[PDB]
């Protein structure tokens, strides 16, 4: 699948490239007995992508459904092991199943992934997800259904009473931060309602499995939309709670504590850009220098999070100098000095100064 340099082609017999949809095998190999030696497409596997660690794998490949009792599943696994099924050309392996636990009403789908990078090695990953597909059983579920129809009514009211404040009232005034936020909540709630309707509008895979209980239950799709819906329903609550600041002005001492922030949010924004430019300047330098032999700087995001953890005084530099000695301790010392004693303070001083003047800007009045 890749190109062998002609100079040493007498030694390199063959190569296997990294995983890619344009370089994925599609031909039978070994004994062509069953479905474990024949490429089955994604469309007739009812699969989907996964977005693993090394890359994003498709839903096709060579699969096999194990048996229902141990003494024959072990025989199938032994048969797979004997006729070599994991050659060097293999790049990913998935094992998945699901359980019910009928005491409470809560399914649980399990997927385990093993990745074989082209540079050798093994990278494991796991995912357990507690789905629930038979919701409407207990009276509490009826109560939850009532409370979510109520939520739909509330979001309808909030969207209509916010549209009413655009063309029937103030035209095109957004720079208030209390209407720019009131739109984010509505949009996120609409998205979360659409996702929830789409998720529970098709549970046909459960019906198909319940028809015949000797096949593989393909619950993989629901376990993804459940995560995608929890990721949205958890951010909406955060902004709803943040919206409470709109109403805390009940006395003459809560008003100046907010005026201070409202008047120092213009000066802090200017310094934030200057701070984060040098922050990224350190981050990229660390990524380029140490990002090959540490693993704390292996990727750019990890480099950023490592510096954020340096600010907390969490990480120990016991291994930084091992990757490089000229730039090993120098980087740490200069970073700490310049961003923990000269640049991290300006965020404090400014605020303090602002507060002072604000107090005067009231006391004189």
């Amino acid at each position: 699948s890749c190109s062998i340099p002609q100079d040493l082609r007498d030694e390199i017999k063959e190569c296997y490239d990294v995983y890619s949809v344009s370089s994925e095998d599609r031909a039978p190999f070994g004994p062509r007995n069953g479905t474990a030696w024949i490429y089955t497409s994604e469309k007739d596997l009812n699969g989907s992508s996964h977005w693993g660690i090394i890359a994003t794998y498709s839903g096709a490949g060579y699969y096999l459904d194990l048996s229902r009792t141990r003494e024959e599943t072990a025989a199938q696994v032994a048969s797979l092991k004997k006729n070599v099924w994991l050659d060097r050309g293999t790049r990913a392996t998935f094992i998945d199943f699901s359980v019910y636990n009928a005491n409470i009403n809560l399914f649980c789908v399990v997927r385990l992934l093993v990745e074989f990078p082209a540079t050798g090695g093994v990278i494991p990953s796991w995912q357990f997800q507690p789905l629930k597909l038979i919701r409407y059983v207990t009276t509490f579920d009826f109560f939850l259904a009532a409370c979510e129809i109520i939520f739909c009514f509330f979001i309808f009211y909030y969207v209509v009473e916010e549209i009413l404040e655009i063309r029937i009232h103030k035209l095109h005034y957004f720079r208030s931060f209390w209407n720019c936020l009131d739109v984010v909540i509505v949009v996120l709630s609409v998205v979360a309602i659409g996702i929830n309707i789409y998720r529970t509008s098709n549970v046909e895979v459960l019906l198909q499995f319940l028809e015949d209980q000797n096949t593989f239950p393909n619950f993989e799709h629901l376990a993804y939309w459940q995560i995608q819906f929890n990721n949205i329903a958890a951010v909406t609550v955060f902004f709803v709670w943040i919206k409470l600041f709109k109403f805390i002005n009940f006395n003459r001492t809560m008003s100046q504590l907010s005026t201070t922030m409202s008047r120092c949010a213009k000066d802090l924004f200017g310094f934030a850009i200057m701070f984060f430019i040098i922050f990224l300047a350190y981050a990229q330098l660390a990524y380029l220098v140490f990002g090959t032999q540490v693993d704390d700087f292996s990727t750019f995001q990890e480099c950023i999070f490592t510096q954020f953890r340096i600010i907390l005084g969490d990480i120990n530099f016991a291994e930084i100098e091992e990757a490089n000695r000229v730039l090993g301790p120098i980087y740490f010392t200069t970073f700490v000095f310049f961003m923990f004693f000269i640049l991290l303070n300006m965020f404090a001083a400014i605020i303090a100064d602002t507060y002072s003047e604000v107090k005067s800007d009231l006391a004189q009045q």
Partner: protein, 761 residues
């Protein structure tokens, strides 16, 4: 003739980074040009001497007239304005001409005069403004002294039957630097309806159209003549490297010269906004297409595409705008036969400063692009390098090797894991047999009783340099069967725990096959090859990976501080063997361009050293710029050395591959150093990019409050460190100072002072 590639989920950074600079560099100068043409909008409403234009010679002027004077010449052109006064050249009235005519030629021919009277014509004749000299004599003391008529025109140098031969010259001199839109952002004449803000729009339109057109012919058109891509070397060919840029530039203009029609002659009511929208759409779609088609470029074509795109720009600058200017001048000279083309010194200084800032930003953006391509130009074999480095340790039992204490555990170590890893069925390709070079130290050590490890390391002497036969010293016939194998000229200095070694030492080739490897191992095991003084062991072989295309230098070392126990250390350096004899790859292109930025930055320092003369030392500007030269030169000259070493080692290995070792390790060092330097120059450029944020009105205080408070901060830290030294002299201050929160108050005082100072203006 087109193929939809959509190959895979790969990414190409050269195309993505080039297109991400030509857009930032435009969004940045947009504000500069807005701030610059606001001055022209508010102002559009002296080398020349004091013009003696006291018109005490004309009378009988019962009307109002206006006289325009064209200050022609080389790099100078202007006109006239309204005479703000109560007289305003009424009946038997006149005035003296003196206006803002800063665009004045030298002490050469500069004269062109017209006079239009609204209504009647006076029966008078005002000769001229015959100045002699006040500042630089940008005019001549002479006059015509002719009568004034309907649209009178007096022309001279220091009626016109054949206007063509002079109208051509006038139109050429006017439009030569006004229609050439590339260098026309700097020299727009006043009272024009083109406004300097869509001059920077058409320019970026041409840039992003050249990028798209060159990106189309590479990777999308590959069926016609198969002449594209691999068959043509990325090196300058002049058959498919300069021709592509020419063709792309030629075909682009019918989109450009049609959108200029919506900027000029647009007062044609709201065409300016529509043209701006069409631009801001075409630029975006061109960038998107360029990215989508370039995300599949092999590492060899993406460097010829850059050269083709650069050469396309050199065609729109040296013969395609000049011919447009000539054609337009010919048109205006052959059809319609047109016959027409304290508060003060503060604005001139501001305009000069803005022009200097504008011309000082393109160089910085080019430098940033070059230094970004020099470092992230191949930022895809970086995760693969980390994976290869990690996978060479977790399968070679790094933890087991690093934990051995007995000096004899080495033999089971190699007999257990090393041999099954080096030799196998098809288990992890090798590219060269290992080696076991050893240093004797000639000064046999006397050990210490066991227990805790004796501090770190001590009790060492010299090094052996002679030959010894089988077993040990007994040289009988010629040289010892265990020769010294003197160190190589280049490629050594491992710098051990507490010693510094070189490439010399008694070597062991270990054989080729597993069985003969065991034979050699046991032979030197029984004959006491490693039980003596025997400072080090220095096991190091190689590693190749063709799936990602990376090599790896592996080195395993044991040091014996005292006889009886050893300390282990291993190093796996993954690199990419890119060689100087491979053509004109990216690491050479962005290493000869960086060498030119280290010369333009050096001559620009000599031109100030000479001008300021002696005693320029002891200032930041004469030191902070010499560091930049000494860094750019090193970054350029280290990569070249690495490229040369690649050729030398690779050809030496290919010469004797079946039986040699060739110790690629040195490259794995240089190819790292060249990455350390190129990752710090970009750091300096990014720091400067933050320092240059002081040009916003309300944000300039941040730099000043940091610079003025710096001495007090250094004084405080010096006091703390000397206090710590005094405390330790009797025989942690970070927590103390971090709890004192001093720096905060020091910065707050200066911030308050500067805010108070800035509040009043």
């Amino acid at each position: 003739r087109f193929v939809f590639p959509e190959p895979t989920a790969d990414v190409n950074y050269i195309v993505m980074l080039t297109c991400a600079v030509c857009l930032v560099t435009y969004m940045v100068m947009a504000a500069i040009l807005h701030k610059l043409d606001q001055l022209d909008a508010s102002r559009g409403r002296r080398f020349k001497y004091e013009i003696l234009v006291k018109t005490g010679w004309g009378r009988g002027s019962g009307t109002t007239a206006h006289v325009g004077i064209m200050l022609y010449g080389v790099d100078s052109r202007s006109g006239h304005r309204h005479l703000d006064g109560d007289r305003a050249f009424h009946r038997n009235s006149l005035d003296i001409f003196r206006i803002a005519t800063p665009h004045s030629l030298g002490s050469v021919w500069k004269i062109r005069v017209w006079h239009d009277n609204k209504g009647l014509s006076p029966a008078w004749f005002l000769q001229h403004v015959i100045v002699r000299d006040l500042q630089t004599a940008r005019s001549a003391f002479f006059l015509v002294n002719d009568w004034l008529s309907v649209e009178t025109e007096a022309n001279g140098g220091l009626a016109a039957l054949l206007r063509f031969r002079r109208l051509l010259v006038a139109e050429l001199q006017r439009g030569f630097f006004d229609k050439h839109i590339w260098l026309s952002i700097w020299d727009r004449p006043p009272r024009s309806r083109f406004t300097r803000i869509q001059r920077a729009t058409c320019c970026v339109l041409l840039i992003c159209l050249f990028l798209g057109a060159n990106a189309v012919w590479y990777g999308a058109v590959g069926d016609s003549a198969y002449s594209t891509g691999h068959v043509s070397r990325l090196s300058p060919l002049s058959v498919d490297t300069v021709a592509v840029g020419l063709v792309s530039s030629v075909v682009v203009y019918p989109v450009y010269l049609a959108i200029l029609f919506l900027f000029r002659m647009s007062r044609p009511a709201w065409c300016a906004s529509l043209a701006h929208g069409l631009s801001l759409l075409l630029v975006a779609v061109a960038v998107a297409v360029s990215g989508w088609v370039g995300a599949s470029f092999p590492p060899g074509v993406s460097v010829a595409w850059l050269l083709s795109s650069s050469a396309s720009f050199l065609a729109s600058f040296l013969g395609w705008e000049p011919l447009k200017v000539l054609l337009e001048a010919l048109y205006f000279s052959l059809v319609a036969k047109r016959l027409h083309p304290f508060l003060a010194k503060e604005e001139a200084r501001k305009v000069k400063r803005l022009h200097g800032m504008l011309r000082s930003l393109l160089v910085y953006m080019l430098f940033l692009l070059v230094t970004l391509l020099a470092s992230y130009g191949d930022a895809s074999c970086h995760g693969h390098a980390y994976r290869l480095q990690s996978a060479i340790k977790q399968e070679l039992h790094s933890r087991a090797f690093l934990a051995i204490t007995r000096s004899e555990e080495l033999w089971p170590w190699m007999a257990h894991v090393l041999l099954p890893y080096v030799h196998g069925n098809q288990s992890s390709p090798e590219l060269g047999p290992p080696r076991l070079r050893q240093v004797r130290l000639q000064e046999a050590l006397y050990p210490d009783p066991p227990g805790p490890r004796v501090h770190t390391c001590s009790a060492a002497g010299g090094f052996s340099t002679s030959d010894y036969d089988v077993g040990w010293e007994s040289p009988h016939n010629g040289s010892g069967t265990w020769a010294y194998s003197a160190p190589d000229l280049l490629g050594a200095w491992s710098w051990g725990s507490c010693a510094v070694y070189d490439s010399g030492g008694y070597v062991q080739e270990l054989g080729l096959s597993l069985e003969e490897s065991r034979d050699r191992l046991r032979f030197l095991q029984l004959h006491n090859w490693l039980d003596n003084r025997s400072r080090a062991v220095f096991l190091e072989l190689t590693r190749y990976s063709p799936a990602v295309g990376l090599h790896a230098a592996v080195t395993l070392r044991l040091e014996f501080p005292a006889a009886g126990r050893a300390l282990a250390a291993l190093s796996v350096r993954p690199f990419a063997l890119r060689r100087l004899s491979a053509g004109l790859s990216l690491p050479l292109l962005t290493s000869v361009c960086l060498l030119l930025f280290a010369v333009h930055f050096a001559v620009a320092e000599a031109r100030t050293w000479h001008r300021e003369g002696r005693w320029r030392v002891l200032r930041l500007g004469a030191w902070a710029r010499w560091l930049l030269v000494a860094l750019t030169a090193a970054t350029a000259l280290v990569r070249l050395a690495q490229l040369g070493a690649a050729d030398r080692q690779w050809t030496r290995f290919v010469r004797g591959r079946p039986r040699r070792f060739t110790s690629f390790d040195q490259v794995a060092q240089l190819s790292s150093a060249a990455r350390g330097l190129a990752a710090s120059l970009l750091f300096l450029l990014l720091v400067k990019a933050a320092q240059q944020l002081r040009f916003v009105r309300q944000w300039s205080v941040f730099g000043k409050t940091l610079c003025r408070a710096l001495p007090e901060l250094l004084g405080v830290t010096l006091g703390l460190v000397v206090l710590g030294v005094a405390y330790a002299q009797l025989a942690w201050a970070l927590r103390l100072w971090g709890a004192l929160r001093l720096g905060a108050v020091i910065l707050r005082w200066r911030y308050h002072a500067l805010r108070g100072e800035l509040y009043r203006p």
